[PDB]
Design a protein around this ligand. Structure first.
Ligand SMILES: [Cl-]
Ligand SMILES: [Cl-]
Ligand SMILES: [Mg+2]
Length: 199
């Protein structure tokens, strides 16, 4: 009916893609269009690696975060998109925390996780830190085979060990993936490390 094109994008911080919950419509962005035709915003769901893709009608769009949704300041961050042919964009946000220098491993007895939690927003506080394992490439606070929360972690160097002994599902798993998550006080979603395949 009208020219259509693929829009590909990423949510980033200082140009680096964010690691998020990419399942269950956990993290969404909105695409707005201003014109005669009173077009409602289009919802786009962000993946685990912070990417999104949409087949849309060619035109001018305003890509923004959804109010109060995501592990970042509720600043209504936005970017103008001129969609004509295959187009790629990024959207800069301000995360509460960033996870870096991750070292994730499993023994027969424990999941060991060493990493750094960097505070980006000066008054942000950590609500919980999560150690996760999954049988699949998808791992998050809902989608996992094993989850252990830590509620007294502060920013800086972190060294955690979660007891996975006696967990038959981990022993049975043909493939095993690990991830860590950090949820800020007042946020609806955590920030994560990349998913690491352990077996
Ligand atoms: Cl062992
Ligand atoms: Cl569990
Ligand atoms: Mg901005």
């Amino acid at each position: 009916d009208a020219p259509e094109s693929k829009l590909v994008g990423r949510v980033t911080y200082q140009g680096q893609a964010l690691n998020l919950r990419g399942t269950g419509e956990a993290v969404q962005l909105q695409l707005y269009q201003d014109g005669y035709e009173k077009n409602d915003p289009i919802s786009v769901f962000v993946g685990q690696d912070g990417t999104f893709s949409a087949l849309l009608f060619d035109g001018e769009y305003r890509l923004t975060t959804r109010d109060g949704n995501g592990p970042w300041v509720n600043n209504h961050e936005s970017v103008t998109v001129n969609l004509k042919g295959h187009t790629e964009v990024n959207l800069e946000v301000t995360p509460y925390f960033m996870i870096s220098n991750e070292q994730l491993s499993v023994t027969g007895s424990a999941m060991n996780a060493s990493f750094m939690i960097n505070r980006i927003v000066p008054d942000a506080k950590i609500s919980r830190v999560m150690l996760l394992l999954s049988k699949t490439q998808f791992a998050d606070d809902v989608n996992n085979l094993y989850r252990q929360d830590f509620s007294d972690v502060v920013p800086g160097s972190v060294n955690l060990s979660a007891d996975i002994s006696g967990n038959t599902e981990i022993v049975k798993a043909k493939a095993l993936y690990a991830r860590v998550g950090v949820l800020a006080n007042g946020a609806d979603q955590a920030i994560y490390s990349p998913v690491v395949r352990l077996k």
